[PDB]
Write a protein that binds this ligand. Sequence first.
Ligand SMILES: N[C@@H]1[C@@H](O)[C@H](O)[C@@H](CO)O[C@H]1c1nc(-c2ccc3ccccc3c2)n[nH]1
Ligand SMILES: N[C@@H]1[C@@H](O)[C@H](O)[C@@H](CO)O[C@H]1c1nc(-c2ccc3ccccc3c2)n[nH]1
Ligand SMILES: *Cc1c(COP(=O)(O)O)cnc(C)c1O
Ligand SMILES: *Cc1c(COP(=O)(O)O)cnc(C)c1O
Lengths: 810, 810
Amino acid sequence: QISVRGLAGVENVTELKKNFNRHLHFTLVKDRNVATPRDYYFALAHTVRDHLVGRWIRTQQHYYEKDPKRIYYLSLEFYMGRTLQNTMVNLALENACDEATYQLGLDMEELEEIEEDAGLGNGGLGRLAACFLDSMATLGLAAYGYGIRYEFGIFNQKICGGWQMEEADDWLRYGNPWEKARPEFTLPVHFYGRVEHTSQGAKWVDTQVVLAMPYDTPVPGYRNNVVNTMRLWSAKAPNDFNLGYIQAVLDRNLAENISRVLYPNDNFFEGKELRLKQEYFVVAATLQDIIRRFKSSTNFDAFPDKVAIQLNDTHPSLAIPELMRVLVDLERLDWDKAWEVTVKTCAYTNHTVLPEALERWPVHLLETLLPRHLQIIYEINQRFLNRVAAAFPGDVDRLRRMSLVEEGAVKRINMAHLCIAGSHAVNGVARIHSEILKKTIFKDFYELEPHKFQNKTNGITPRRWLVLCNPGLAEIIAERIGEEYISDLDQLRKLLSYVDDEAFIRDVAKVKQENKLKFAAYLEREYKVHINPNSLFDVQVKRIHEYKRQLLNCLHVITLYNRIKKEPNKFVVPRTVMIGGKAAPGYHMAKMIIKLITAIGDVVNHDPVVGDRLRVIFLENYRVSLAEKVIPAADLSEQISTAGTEASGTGNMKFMLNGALTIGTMDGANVEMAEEAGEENFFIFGMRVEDVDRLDQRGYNAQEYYDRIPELRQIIEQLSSGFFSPKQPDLFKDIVNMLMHHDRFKVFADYEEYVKCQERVSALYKNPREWTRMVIRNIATSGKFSSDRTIAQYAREIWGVEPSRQRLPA
Amino acid sequence: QISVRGLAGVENVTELKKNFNRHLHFTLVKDRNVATPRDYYFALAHTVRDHLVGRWIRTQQHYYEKDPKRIYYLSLEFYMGRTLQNTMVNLALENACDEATYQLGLDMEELEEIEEDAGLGNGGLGRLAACFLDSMATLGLAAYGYGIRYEFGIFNQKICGGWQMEEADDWLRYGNPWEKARPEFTLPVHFYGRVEHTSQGAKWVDTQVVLAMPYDTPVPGYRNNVVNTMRLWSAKAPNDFNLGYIQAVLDRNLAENISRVLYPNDNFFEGKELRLKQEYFVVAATLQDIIRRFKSSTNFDAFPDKVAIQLNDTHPSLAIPELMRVLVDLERLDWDKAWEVTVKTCAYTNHTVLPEALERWPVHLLETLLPRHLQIIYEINQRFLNRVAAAFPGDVDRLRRMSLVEEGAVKRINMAHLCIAGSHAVNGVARIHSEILKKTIFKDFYELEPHKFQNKTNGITPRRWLVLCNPGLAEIIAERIGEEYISDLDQLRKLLSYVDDEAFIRDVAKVKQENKLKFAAYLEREYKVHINPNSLFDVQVKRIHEYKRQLLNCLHVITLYNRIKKEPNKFVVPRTVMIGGKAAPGYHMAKMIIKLITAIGDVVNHDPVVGDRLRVIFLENYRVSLAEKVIPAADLSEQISTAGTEASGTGNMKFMLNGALTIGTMDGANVEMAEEAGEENFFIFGMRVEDVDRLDQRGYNAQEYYDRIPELRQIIEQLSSGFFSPKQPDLFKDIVNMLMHHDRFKVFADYEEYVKCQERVSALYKNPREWTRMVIRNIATSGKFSSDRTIAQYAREIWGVEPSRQRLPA
Ligand SMILES: N[C@@H]1[C@@H](O)[C@H](O)[C@@H](CO)O[C@H]1c1nc(-c2ccc3ccccc3c2)n[nH]1
Ligand SMILES: N[C@@H]1[C@@H](O)[C@H](O)[C@@H](CO)O[C@H]1c1nc(-c2ccc3ccccc3c2)n[nH]1
Ligand SMILES: *Cc1c(COP(=O)(O)O)cnc(C)c1O
Ligand SMILES: *Cc1c(COP(=O)(O)O)cnc(C)c1O
């Protein structure tokens, strides 16, 4: 039916149906009378996977014969979401499968909804990994994502009594048609042991062995017949393992626990052993695989011309000492040559400046678990500190601050320092974030090695984040400017000359309305809740965190509520305020915030005076596949972190792409978004970075805001006295308390400017034509935030590789 | 090439090749340049599985429409072995796959060897279950095998320093192309809880829930297009399970341990909780499945006309109280009606009379774990004991002996008594065994209910145990009498009129010789050991156990050795003595026996005076697929258990079928084998049942044999003094000791008659023509021991079902 969904040729359709019935009989062992929709999803999934196969074999083939430089993207997280629609989109099968399934009288859209999210990440970081893979494939790069195949992904979020409950995300229960187990490339990983010295050199002995078994997942490029690989390792016990008898066999669990579960903390370090085992496991098995693949081209000098290893934060920072261990202890290169090889191979992306997110591992942990790596780390440190001493003679304090070893009650290794020492490039993830790295957190490193520091502002793939989740907007755009923008997002600027085209204005607004209608129904059906879809859709979707300031949003919500109650008969632009996100299981305050939100919902949604002027909806189980539904439906995107705390953000970009206006602070990539659209086209409010710092110097006193702002004071009194929790009047005492005495994120500082800015949004919503011209100005300048731009920048400025857009043959 | 292997039609062959390349590309994602033999095995396995599918769907279909009475074979063990060749044989594909693979230049026989044994059993009992399935399918019965899909089967056996080491049998490591996961028919199983009483009735509450997820395996009939199902349950935790966070997820192991590992004790009870959980798990999930299938035909009166449940020993005896629980507590039938339903549904096969193999569960165990079932058991007991009292008034002692509850320091439930009480038929497994049940172990039950007691002598399937493992013998038989014998084994009597046919004599002997050559090479290649293949092949293959008397065999071996040393220049028929079998991991004495055997091998195989007159080979890792190789190669079958201890045996039958003569005691099915062949055609020696009993009454004194038999005394002295263990001279003190003071199995009683009988075997081996006429007389009368005979007897005399041989359509 729509043209960006490709051709539905009579041969293709006939062929898809034929194969759909083949898989149902042969793969699924079902006939047409007993098949459930789950079965139909499956037969469709095997039919689409069939189209990937020749392309996958041919791509892996071509890399063997061309032997280009290979990129290894190492991450503990890959937040994939569903695979079926993405695969159709990338192979131009969407319309033909739609047609094929229709003629068997099945509805594709209904089948698509049965597929489980692969939720192997927490939020922005794992999801960036996913976008990056799609972009690497679309840009023809010989790139491999490497991670852990967790048996349980991010937990499923239930609400009970307005509280978060956690359930295990058992995503493999029904099988994963997308992965291919490769038990033939199983590799040993070593743990514990001790180090002996020979005349030969150091030797790591008496280790426990855990096996790493890889699972391969196809990553198709956008219509280029390139299919790359994501390889994910699983832990398996060896068979002599432990080997009274029964118990030995049952104790094989203790080794396979390494890959059992994703750690669910977003932007927060927890120094547990099982986590460090996860990090060593993925690093050890990957390096052997990388090395094996290099030996099928004695000579390690060429290694950096054949291999780039990108580290996704510090989570795989052990790649650096592991690479040293292999080169020094097993390959017998001298120290300096090995070190040159390592530094030229490795690059580090930093994703955060929150000090509680920075990985600092206790020494006693690394000493029991990885005792050779601890030796290598010390040796790295000593040599690094000798370079600091020679460049800054006498600056003793520099030496202490720059050490990889933190002194203190418990000695720690600062993994970020290890990454900077052992990488040729260190990048941040938006311009302002990269500037903060050079000015504060890594100022010392930057003075030593200015040439290492770079910026690579994040992007999102427009395949999933536009073509796939928003076919109607994709189509009306293609109707005006063609299809070429989908792999060249800068082309969206051509849309500026349509900003006064009456028919374009109408089409952008109609697509938004259709998405609102579709999402409003999805609310009704799956969670029995009624929204007015003429209202403005105010959405804040992201992990629950104090720095992200869902609490600021709550204050605005409660204010609107209080204003309606004071003057009940006054006009007010209707809103639906939707806030969604998971809280880490032990982050008590994030759990209270979820509770505050739903408690506000209970008061607000049941007030008859309110009518349908204000609704507050907490969106349960926020995940990739729910982002695909709500983001196209949003009018207002809330990006309201304290200036200097959100490294980049990427939800922000998703919404700019999809026809929402942004109310945000000058934080993270919001700064670049505003500069691409024009500050007039954005709702900028609040402290700048500079303002937060001025506040830190004289001291943040929240009391001052509470005395000066009567509307703020009423809200605190309401929170305090049990307005929102009449059965437990003191339920929110921890929230009030934090806000008044211990708020690291200056929620009151920004309140007054936020409410004013929220009034300007309502004023523009009153004028549909102008709301939409501004929407057009946003969508039109969202080109920069394509992850294709970001990856082409990594490729040229870090990896030394040319992207191409040229199709491999079919 | 050979005619029992079916047709190799030009269309078939072309089609198999086409599909073989299809699966290699599409299923396996490999091309021809990177494929390993494991890959080729796999593509061949998916190609053959494709031929099963339409037949499987059509069979399950036909049972729904015909609605015949359904048989449920409940066993904790199913010893399957490999599936590929069996499937080809049964679908008449063997020659065409052979041809198809040859033209791709691959050797089928080499691919077949990559398949793992499904070793989900310990020995005779699990293997009988497997033969029974093949026979049920071949006889057209609507039959389902139900068990547990263990992640680890019987351990792999390594020898180190002549000792058994155990390794985990990780048979699913590479996937199982034969099973189809059916996560849609997942069923709850309940554990722990407590019982409340309502006005409604008893109610089992506050239980832990474990999920049972079924895996289906096709069981093809012999060329009849019937394909039955073996359904095996896997344990899965529920998702709210336990649900700080990480630990909850990791603790899902404690529920899934239920299906993790097969208990490895053959013919020995170990009362561990995990085992009782295994037994309840398979019973609970199966009964729900049975019941669900019955409700798609209010009325439970018809239930016994629609369902037979056969219990494989007492291992699923909880079926009986579970069936009561469902009917009484959930379906709300009164007690008596429920009881009538249960007794008419259930039948019990006993497989052993060894008192240490009998399941007696501690009460405190059933009370914590299954507290309602314990109530039901008591109620069953009380009512049963009231029937005993009314039939035998005043016989107080009868009441105590017949109780389901054993009094004692620890109260126990005698599960065998529960089975007899709650079944309409109780059968033993050979005639002499069934007679011992009625005369000793269950004399009291038999006086109460004579009509319940039956015999059903075991059989083996001739598809695996002749056509498949011994194509050459199958073929020379088909050359004379046709192919029809393969599903009608009695037809082998026609072979008696060929007992003086010179060409037949030559062919039987040539096939034996070829098998010896083939097996002798397999020894050379896989385990670097040299056998003379002109020697007589004396094999004893079975689990290692004191009652099976591998020790008797050792004594014979050592005697032959001593005789050669006394008169080194005298002629002696050369032998290769091969003994193989696993020992249960904690059965110390069985572990010492393995050690004695290999220690005898070290002395005997290195004596230059011996030459190649005597070799002693311990065959490592005895399993189904090694039985398929050694049994066709055997000349002499050793079946030498003390009279009254081996319930039936089935190895005995395998060898009669395959051209070995038998030296055995009048135990188990040896008695029927001898009577079918004629006692002249068998090497019968030793105490009868009656003789063992005479010995028990005056007392077994092993000293008396040691004083009277000088050849026996020399052997004990050699064992004692370190002849066989010169570095640890006292290594065998436990063996000598047991033999002298604590031998429950009267090894010395039988020694003297055994050695004499072994001399008669050597005398006949000297005359090839007469050895072979006698072999012919055995193979010719082995018809009775077909498991088709056994199953047709179960079907008519217990299940009330007519077998048919009529093909379903193709
Ligand atoms: N918060 C940043 C976000 O601004 C940025 O857009 C995105 C991609 O660059 O990454 C986000 C981010 N996630 C994490 C993170 C995620 C999981 C962790 C697990 C353990 C220890 C630290 C951890 C740190 N950092 N930055
Ligand atoms: N020993 C008998 C054998 O003579 C007979 O041929 C075969 C089939 O009927 O079954 C053998 C048998 N196995 C067992 C057995 C096997 C596994 C067990 C696990 C736990 C407790 C008892 C157990 C008892 N009994 N009889
Ligand atoms: C894009 C995305 C994120 C990151 O969102 P931010 O607003 O940058 O925190 C987190 N989760 C999901 C499911 C996403 O799609
Ligand atoms: C037939 C068979 C058995 C049973 O053998 P017995 O001699 O009756 O103890 C045990 N194991 C395997 C592998 C078999 O094939």
